[PDB]
């Protein structure tokens, strides 16, 4: 059981509560002795018991492991290679569309360097299309299928957590430490991501002019935000600096396109979590340790995972 106040934030309601200052009793190096300790926690790491009493999000479902502080999450490139007596064939046709006869081919030992970047809604740092913003799906005429689009040129996203958190170590057992967030230096400001409006507007124009091949010239076509579901899928959920971000994309996908300044970049607010699950799993949670200082990372958006309703 945790006793939690808000951090001293006095802004708009519920946003005051977006991070909590929780204190609790914890085991020491010695079996017979407890210690009273405190940590900051983000609102999404905790749930209320019923009063100011809280527990971690996972305790009624999963055991939890601290991710070791030394192992990096950086997506280092992997090449996949075939055993002797097998070969990889590479399609060379620039206007290949994911199925059927590729009329131009070469053979290799291994793939190019693939980065295991994990991100929902938008595809980050992955390979550009050879020419045109190519669109792929297994059956476009069915609305239930996802539709990948792959840009011929990157549109650049800058993400940040501008709070300067401190790391703190608590021993919880003989030779075992828990990394809490100690406090925050200076001003509190929201974690967010920016993308340039002209380049995003133009790039969305190019995706429409390719959907106009598969859907015809008469149709006005529209973009909308995701309708509902888990936080993992209703948001551009992704990793930056080793923090996990959950940006509200409703500023990107909000336009309707006719059958026919600018420096103001749009900005997406992002919530953050420390307690997480690999999205294809339940029953084993992970706690991501807190990162010192300000976080920034710069990345290329190079494709999208769209869906269609059924203009």
């Amino acid at each position, epitope marked *: 059981t945790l006793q939690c106040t808000n951090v001293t*934030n006095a802004i708009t309601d519920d946003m005051r509560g977006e991070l909590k200052n929780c204190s609790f009793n914890m085991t020491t190096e010695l079996r017979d002795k407890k210690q009273k300790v405190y940590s900051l926690f983000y609102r999404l790491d905790v749930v209320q018991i019923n009063n100011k009493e809280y527990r971690l999000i996972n305790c009624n479902t999963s055991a939890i492991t601290q991710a070791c502080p030394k192992v990096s999450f950086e997506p280092i490139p992997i090449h996949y290679c075939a055993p002797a007596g097998f070969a990889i064939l590479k399609c060379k046709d620039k206007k290949f569309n994911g199925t059927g006869p590729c009329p131009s081919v070469s053979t290799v030992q291994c793939t190019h360097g693939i980065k295991p970047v994990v991100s929902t809604q938008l595809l980050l740092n992955g390979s550009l299309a050879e020419e045109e913003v190519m669109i792929r799906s297994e059956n476009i005429t069915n609305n239930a299928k996802n539709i990948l689009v792959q840009f011929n040129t990157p549109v650049q996203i800058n993400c940040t957590r501008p709070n300067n958190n401190t790391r703190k170590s608590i021993r919880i057992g003989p030779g075992q430490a828990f990394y809490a967030t100690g406090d925050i230096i200076g001003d*509190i400001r929201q974690a*967010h991501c920016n993308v340039s409006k002209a380049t995003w507007n133009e790039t969305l124009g190019k995706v429409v002019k390719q959907l106009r091949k598969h859907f015809g010239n008469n149709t006005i076509i529209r973009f909308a935000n995701s309708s509902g579901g888990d936080l993992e899928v209703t948001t551009h959920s992704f990793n930056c600096g080793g923090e996990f971000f959950y940006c509200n994309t409703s500023g990107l996908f909000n336009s309707t396109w006719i059958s026919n300044g600018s420096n103001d970049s749009i900005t997406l607010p992002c919530r953050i979590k420390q307690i997480i699950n690999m999205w294809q799993r339940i029953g084993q949670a992970m706690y991501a340790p807190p990162i010192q200082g300000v976080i920034r990372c710069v990345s290329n958006i190079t494709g999208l995972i769209l869906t269609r309703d059924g203009t």
Partner: antibody
Amino acid sequence: EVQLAESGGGLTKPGGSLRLSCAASGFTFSDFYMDWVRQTPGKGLEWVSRINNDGRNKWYADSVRGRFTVSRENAKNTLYLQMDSLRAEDTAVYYCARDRPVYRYWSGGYHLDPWGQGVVVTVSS
Amino acid sequence: YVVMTQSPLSLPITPGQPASISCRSSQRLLHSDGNTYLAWYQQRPGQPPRRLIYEVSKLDSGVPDRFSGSGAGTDFTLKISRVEAEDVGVYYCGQNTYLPYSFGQGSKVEIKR
């Protein structure tokens, strides 16, 4: 248009306490740092204390550290200086002023603008 | 602490004439974000200090364009291209880069007669 106004200045004997109020108008007061600055007819302008926007962080001049505490009530758009252990040297006019903005994604530079109307404070037996 | 001082202490000036006020610090006022948080205030008789100039050279809202400000490192100047009757008062340079914030001893303007 932005305005600040102050109340609660007056006379006291030494060793006593006074509380000043400054009230904010024409802006979202919880987006700004705030300062107290005093004028003595001799030495002129002297910085006294600063507070950040959520009130977690506070700073003081050496002449007042621990004798004074600054505090704020964002729900009331209002700032207080609680002065204790006053001396004849604390005789001054006290002005409040507005400092660093903290907009939702971004923090600005430091400022003293605008300044209040000012309150007279006098310390003698 | 960072000391501030202005070189002319009093300026008897004729209405319509230019006037200028040097200000100097004990240490460089360029801050770790790349700005220089010097500013100039004036105080007419019986009134609170009013800011005129900030970040060395930017003007406050509604300040008359006859005011100007310039400088670098430790050495700075106000200049007024012509004084008016509403320019009669006391002028202070000050700095916000380093705590405690600090002010010059200030310079008087008076009507030369």
